[PDB]
Every structure is written in C-alpha cells, then in structure tokens.
C-alpha cells in the first residue's frame, strides 16, 4: 500500500525523517524534565501564629473555631490540626482532581471573617510541594557574628532570592531577629510609683510621623510633615516616664523568644534559608534562576567576608539522575546494537535496524511536547528498545531470509501480524494509563513514551527500512526437542500444569510493597528530645547528636534544625530536632556499607545517645509522607478519644508492642509528653476585694515576661520591634513572679500573689486533631521487611494484645499502606478488563477462538521468571514490579502471536515452529538484554525501574524457554483434537 | 494605597516598601514598579505573558491584605482595565450651576 | 522630548520633635504629631450620613 | 505610528508649585494651544484623579 | 522602552526565518526532485526583496 509509494520517495522520505528528527530534538529541548516527579496530592495549610499562648489555649481558643469554619470546605479529603505553643497549624489535604489555586481560594474563603480574640490573623502557608525544598543555603563568615548575618539574611539574601521567578518564598531558619529592648526591675516601678500598664502605654504612646498636608506660601505650596519616629536605641531612652526611660532600667538591643535554633558542623548557632519553588514549576529552571541570584549575591550584593553557600541543591540530584539514566540508556542501545550485529550478519543492515531506535524516540518526543507530557528520567529509564525495534526485526528477518526485485510483497506479508502485534503491545500498557494518583504521576510518561515510540516504530519499519538497500548446533538440537514433543500429552500437560502451580506457589507467598525507596542524595532525621527542655539545652543535645553523626566517613555536612522555622510552617517544639545529613558522593566512601547498612549503623549508633530517639527518612519523601496521613513516617497507629492521659497510656502500650514486631523499625510516640507550666489562675474574689482588673494581670504576664512588642520602630527601609521586659532574674521562678507588682483602684501597688493563685502543672506540648477529633499518633517506619507481611503479623497483635476502650479511644492505622492498597484495588479493577479487550484482539487476527485462549494463557509462563527473579534477587512485589509484569506480558503475548502465526501432522508443527525460531529468539534476546543494563544497581535515580527490569528479564527468560517447547505442543494437542 | 496629608518620604517608608515586601514572591510576576508620593503610593505590577487576569488580581489581592498600614491606609487594587480601555471622556456642563 | 521624569524636590516645612525638650517639658510626641495631623492638615473626625 | 484622532501631552511644571498656580499654567497652555485652527478641544488635567 | 518589543521581535522572526525557507526547500524539492532547481527557485526570494 504505502510501501509502494515509499520507494520513489527515497529522497523525500529521508528529508522527512531527517527534519522530523530535528523537530524531535527541538521537542526534547522544549520538553521540561523531572528527576523526582511530584508525589504529593493537592494540599494547603493555614498558619495562625499567636504570640504567647500555650498549646491548650491555642487549640481551644483558636484552632477549634477555625476548624468549625474550615470543615465544610469543597473538595475536602482530610483536615488535621496540630496546635503547639504559640502556633496553630491546620493542614488540609484535598481530594483527587481539585486544582491548587481553587482549593486555596476555598480555604482562604473559610479562614477570613473569623473572630480569633487575640488579634491572631490566620494565613495560608506558601504554595509549594513537600518536594519543594530545592536550595537550602547557609550564609557563612569567618568574622561577622550571628546578628549581622541575620540582618544580611533578612534585608539582602531573602528579598533577592524572593525576586527569582518560580520562587514563592524562602523560609528563614535560626539566626537572631533584632529588637529594641528595655531591661528593668519591677522594684524600680515600685520605686517611681509607675504601673506596668503606664510604661508600655507610654513607650508606645508616641512612635509616629505625621503628614500635615499642604501649606501655601505665595505661588509655591509646601508639604507639612513631622518626624517623631525613633531612629535608634538612644532615641528610646528619652521617652517621658523628670524620670527618663534610661534612668529607668537600661535600654539595649535584644531579641524575642527564639522560635528555632540551627546548627551545622561544629557550629552550635547559625542561620540558614530554604528556597521554595512554586507548585508545579519545573525545578531545574527555577534552579538556574536561583543560581544566577545566588552568584549575584555572593559576587556583588553581599559583603566580602559573608558568602551564601548551599548544603542542599536539587540540581545535584538532577545531574546525578541525568548521568545514571543517560549511562543506562546508552548501554541499552549499545547492547541492542551489539546483539543485532551478532545475529544479523551485515553490519550496515544492523545499523539500518539500529536507526529505528533514535528516530522512534524523536517521534515520541514530538508527541510528548504537544501533549505537554513531562519526561521523568527515572520512568523513561526503562525503555530498552526491545519492543520498539521488534517491528524492525520481523521485517528484516522476513526480507533477508526470503532473499538468501520487489521487497514490498513479503513486507506486505509480514505487515498484518506485526501491526496487530503492535496494537497488542500498546493495549497491554492500558492498565498503566488506568491507575491514578501517585503511581500514575510516577509511571505515566513511560507508557506514553513507549506507545508513541510504537507508532514511530511502524513509521520507520515501513516508510524507511524496506526502502533501504554457533547457530549450526542450535538448529538440530531444536529439531531434537520438538521431536520429543510428539505426543506425550499427559507428561506435557504435567509440565505445563506444574509450571502453573509453580507460579501459583511462588507468587502467593512474597512481599507486597508500594515503592522501592526512591533513593535520594541525603538522609533526613526525625529526633525527639525530653519534654520541657529549654532552647539552650536542646541546642546542646543537637550539638552532641550532630557531632555523633559527623563520626561517619560517609557524611559530609550534618545540619540540625531545633524547634521550628520563623515562618510557622512546622509545628515543632524545642524538644524536636530535624537533622539534614548530606552524604558524600557514593564513590568517595571509604567504608564498604551500602546506604541502608549505613542507616542501620547510624541508628544503632544514635541508640547509644542520651535522651534522643532518631527516626529515618529522606527530605522529599519525608515531606510527602508527612502530608500522606498522620506524621512523618512510613506508617502510623492513631489512638483517638478526648482523654489525653488515656490515649497516652494506650499509645504507650502500642508503642511498646510495635517494637516487638520484626517489620517495625523506628517507633516513636510522636507528640512529646506534657511539659512543665507555671499556671497563673486569677482569683476574682480576691480581685474584687483588692479592686484589681484581670486585664492588668494579663498585661503584666504578656508584656512583663513575654515582651510582646509595644510599638514598631522604622530605620531606613528596615523595621524592628520595641519591647519592655522585666530583667533577668526578675522572673526566674514562681516565687519571683508572685512578688511582681501591678497597680490598683485604691492607688496601691499589689503583688499578684495576693490575687492570682500561682501553681505548677504540666500540660500537652502539641495537641493533634484529625477531622475535629482529638487523637495521638504512634509513628513507625518499617525497614528490613515487607509492608504487607508486617501488617499481617502486626495489626492483629494490636487488636489482640492491647486492651482499650471503655470510654471512647478507638484505634486506627495509616501511612503508605492505604495508598498501596488503593493502587492495588485500582489495578485489579482494570486488570481483567484489558484481558478481555486483548482477548478480542487475539480473536480478530486468528479468528479461530483457540489461539486467543492459548496465547492469552501463555502469560503464566512469563510470570514464572518474573517471580523467580524477584525472589532470587531478594526484591519485592510492588508498583514498579507490577509494571515489569505488564511489559513482560506484552512482549510475551507478542512473541506468542509471532510464533503461532507461522504455526506430516506433528511435522507441520516441527517445521512451522522451526521457521519462526529466529525472530522469536532474536526479539526475546534484544528485549531482555535491552533492560539488562538497566538492572545495574549503583546510581542516583537508579532504582525505580530496577525491579521493572528484573521482572522483564527473568520473566522473559522463562517465557521464551517455555514458549518454544510447551506452546506448539499445546497447539498440536488442541488443533488435532 | 491612598493616605491624605502624608508626605512623600513617609509614604515610601511606611507604606510602599512593606507592601512591596509582601507582594514580591507573587506567582508569575514579571516586573513590579512603585511610585511613592504625596497623597498616595501606587504600586504597579506587570505579569509574565500568558497570565490570566482574575488569576493575577487574585494573587495581588492574596498578597496586599494583612499588612502594617500605620495611618489607617487601606491598599486597594485599581479597577480591572486596559491602557487602551478608557472609552468615554465626558464633562458636566451647565450655565446655571456651580462646581459643587 | 527629553526630561528627568520625576520632578526636582519640592520645599517642605519639616517639624522635628526634640526628644530632650519633650522630656524637659513633659510632652508626648503623639500629642504634637496629632496636633499637626488633626489640627493643621486635618483628618476627618467622623463620617456623616445624609 | 498608529495614530488615533487625538494628541496627548505630558507636561512638567516648576517643582512644588501651588495647585492654583499650576491651574493658571494649564489655562495659559490651553489658551496658547487654542490658537491653532486645527484643534477643537484642549483639555488639561493638572494633578491626579480622585 | 519600546525597543524592548523591537529586540524581541527582531530575534523572534530570525529564529523561524531560515526554518520556513528550509521547509520551503523541502516542498520545492518534493515536486521537482531536482537539487539545483529548487535552489534556483528559492533564489527568487531576494529578487522580490529589491
Ligand atoms: Zn518539612
Ligand atoms: Zn514572608
């Protein structure tokens, strides 16, 4: 048909595929690439930051009435709220299909128009993915101290980076926020007869400038203005309170309560920042921009001694992924070309078949460009060109073997079975298109790239290729085993059935997981400290931990983040550390251990550390795990109910129980035990007898101890706060606070201990609520075992060996298990449906109804090697492995089609099978040896497609081993009976 | 942001600059300029090509609100329109009335 | 047509509150500011709805 | 080009001038422009809009 | 200024300008199958330019 008009097009079609190749190049160049695809489903958080409030106060008086509004939001999937000291954090994760800015507008519509009595203004966190951390930088200097570095961060580095297109915000960590401060003794306020209310209502009475509009003199108008704005620390001392504010206790620089403390190698205190890309923006480009920005800072904007340098960069992961995938695919192409050169005699011809490889890819890139399909280098890691090139094989086998005039005839003869074989392959990838969410967002471009390559393969195998112009002992041995296939149908069905039961036994018992760990270039650490710890002590424990990590030759820079960032994104207390461990290049390691083994070594090492429990993650996967269900972990056990102590008890029981089960590895109770509080309970009776308003006491507490800013000072473009605070030991303890004074209606200083009863009681550190219900969480990561097997052995012992209930407290599970199960169900729904469609496709070509049955039931022959590989290699059955089975089944049923199409009763079978031996063995060989180099372990971005490749290769070995023996025997057993 | 009587330097200092600080990270922004002067601060933002209108204005709106606002000034986005979009220019004319 | 765009700086009467003298006579800077705010240029005390 | 049916003018005056004086400047600009037989209307906007 | 558009467009066409004349070359080569001839007919472009 087209192969007729093709020959005289020899010049034209060449230019066609050439310019098309160029358009494919431009397609790739304009095709945004992703090393680590965005895993996390659409979600957003509302951050209400209340200055001084305790955890309980935040939860009850802020978080809950916010929950009442947020609860009925459109597209709501799960709504959780963590309320910690000075912070109310509401994480809302939405359903599948809700876009970002939409749901953002919805939450924004909910959280506005609320009350929030403390002046708390709820706000949505930056719009970014949990994988959004790209440039993590620390600005360093060998002279300048922390405060100067902090100023440089705030007023130089932050805005400059924030200008970068693609960057939503840059989160600030550590450092010192500078404020103008007044340090004075209450004995002095009792000395000069001044109330604590008066001094603050004074210092903040006047800070301002005033426009006086326009004053007319002659024909020239003059703007009337005036300046009362305090420009410095000295201007503060002169506020009237002839007693000066400076004659009153000293006026100096200071900082508010530190929300977080950061450290790096041998550096207990420093400052860093975290660049957040905006949502769906391609990381590498935004990284080019931020690279330009950073170098613009270091070379130009920042002082000579201060230089911003990153401890974490996404472009590095990108480059490592690029190198690994590049080397892999290059090796694949080389092996295909090599084996092609080995089977096919003529080298030039082998090249003619070889040019099918780059062209069909360039065919696909044009489509992926116009369909806006991104290129995930990890999923595109498995292609192997043992599918795409098969179409070029069967014709080349057809032509050449037919020769040793008009080639279009035999090309036409082989045109029908290969085209339907092509459709069979592309329809076999239907279940990949079927599944949704994470696994889709991961594997999607592979299925499209292959399918579009299949269409591009036919374009090469027809409009180009035909228009281009030890086996000796393998032959009779094959005739010998086909000769053994005569009759013996009982022993033959013995073999077939034994193989079926084989994959049954081997398949039924095996590990069932979700994803193969998706290695990154670092390690994230979740550390929990003792309850009620000061920032200083937390920083010291962080120092010791960080120093214990640096002991390892594999680590490079250990960054420890104590508490939470100044932005309010993380609901972390001072009792919590997040440690970023950046490993050296894997080749530089002088210790033999693999990353997992290093993980175990670090774990066992940290077990010898005082007051520290360390869970293990990687930064991005940690983010998406956090967004997934309850916490940062592979799995969680949630204990519901409104009683904190009760849920605490049961959660301790389950916490201790999970440590018994082999699968579970890192087990923590999550929310820290309650911390010591000094509780001031105002007695209104005594307040009535002494004539004291509660507002006075509350103000004394907030401004006296806390130092909530009284006014705001403006200096140049910069601004700071101004705070009047009791000095040092003024409050060291309950007794001192009791002896503090405030005014009265009768004009006499009264100690608050005469009115407000001061006691000591512990209270919850962080209150977590899932869907308007209070609960606690047991965080657990599992390592060294299977997920499904672990929930098999555990999850029973929880419902058996753990006594609970009476009043409320019901348990529950969460983490990646629910995700894996959803994917499993979604796969098993579309799985039988595609079997039926491929059953009609097989019924279309042969139209005997026997061949569809036989060929479609040739699949378990392929399943064998898929299972023996995953068992022998020690791998696990998962999404990637499942995909492996998909592709494997595709090439298996294709090879069955090709074999049977060409298939003296049993002699017809022997000769018929013999004729088709070469292209079957060849296509099998190239398809296996295609994904063989992708089974090479070492690399970054290396393991996604590794199990895919394993299943494909092993499965293909056994599929081909069986199909050249069992298949024609079964054929002979049916068609002759 | 229109605040009457306030001088130029104070308009830049206490109004324009913080508003700019909260605006800057705005999604898909091309160039932001600001002119600060007696009576008001005008912050103009042009967006990278291919940006929807109500989208952009929703972003700007999502930024400017919830800020300092010393003098009671209330930042508000100018009417959605185009430089070529003033289609009618009229005058009120009467012999028998006055400007009030 | 070539100009400097933004015009040269205008004359202004600058009222700078002296902190020391404000301490000596006991005056809040707020009093003075609001004096040149409400008193001189003027600020609306309230709104009348007819 | 791409001319419309009109001519627009960007005018800068002495710095910090009174709005009344600038009003008079506008008046002289209009009066001087109207001397052209080709112009039907000359509209001056001094200051800004509301 | 306005040149921001100019330098954007001047390069813009310059990217796709040879691209279409290379595509036109493909077409002309398609029907005639000659090499010299579509080159000669492609030489008609500067003739009109004058
Ligand atoms: Zn985080
Ligand atoms: Zn910010």
Short mmCIF file of C-alpha atoms in Angstrom, two decimals, chain A residues 205-206 208 210-213 220-230 235 238 240 244, chain C residues 10-17 19-20 22-23 26-30 33 36-37 40-41:
data_model
loop_
_atom_site.label_atom_id
_atom_site.label_comp_id
_atom_site.label_asym_id
_atom_site.label_seq_id
_atom_site.Cartn_x
_atom_site.Cartn_y
_atom_site.Cartn_z
CA UNK A 205 2.10 56.25 73.08
CA UNK A 206 4.48 58.04 70.78
CA UNK A 208 4.99 58.02 64.63
CA UNK A 210 2.65 62.98 60.81
CA UNK A 211 1.70 64.44 57.45
CA UNK A 212 0.34 67.98 57.70
CA UNK A 213 -0.85 68.18 54.08
CA UNK A 220 4.64 77.71 45.95
CA UNK A 221 2.99 75.03 48.09
CA UNK A 222 4.98 73.23 50.79
CA UNK A 223 4.18 69.84 52.30
CA UNK A 224 3.90 69.98 56.08
CA UNK A 225 5.40 66.91 57.70
CA UNK A 226 6.88 65.88 61.02
CA UNK A 227 9.14 63.21 62.43
CA UNK A 228 8.70 61.57 65.82
CA UNK A 229 9.87 58.17 64.64
CA UNK A 230 12.61 56.76 66.85
CA UNK A 235 16.13 57.88 70.94
CA UNK A 238 14.40 59.73 76.18
CA UNK A 240 8.98 60.53 79.18
CA UNK A 244 13.85 59.14 81.73
CA UNK C 10 9.81 70.40 46.47
CA UNK C 11 10.13 72.66 49.53
CA UNK C 12 8.70 71.31 52.79
CA UNK C 13 8.34 72.57 56.36
CA UNK C 14 9.90 69.84 58.50
CA UNK C 15 8.77 69.59 62.12
CA UNK C 16 11.22 67.52 64.16
CA UNK C 17 10.19 66.73 67.73
CA UNK C 19 13.21 64.20 72.44
CA UNK C 20 15.19 66.00 75.13
CA UNK C 22 9.93 66.71 75.07
CA UNK C 23 11.32 65.19 78.25
CA UNK C 26 6.75 66.58 79.68
CA UNK C 27 5.16 66.34 76.24
CA UNK C 28 4.31 63.16 74.34
CA UNK C 29 5.42 63.14 70.69
CA UNK C 30 1.97 61.74 69.95
CA UNK C 33 2.05 64.61 65.84
CA UNK C 36 -0.05 68.68 63.09
CA UNK C 37 -2.28 65.82 61.93
CA UNK C 40 -3.06 71.63 60.64
CA UNK C 41 -3.61 69.47 57.55
#
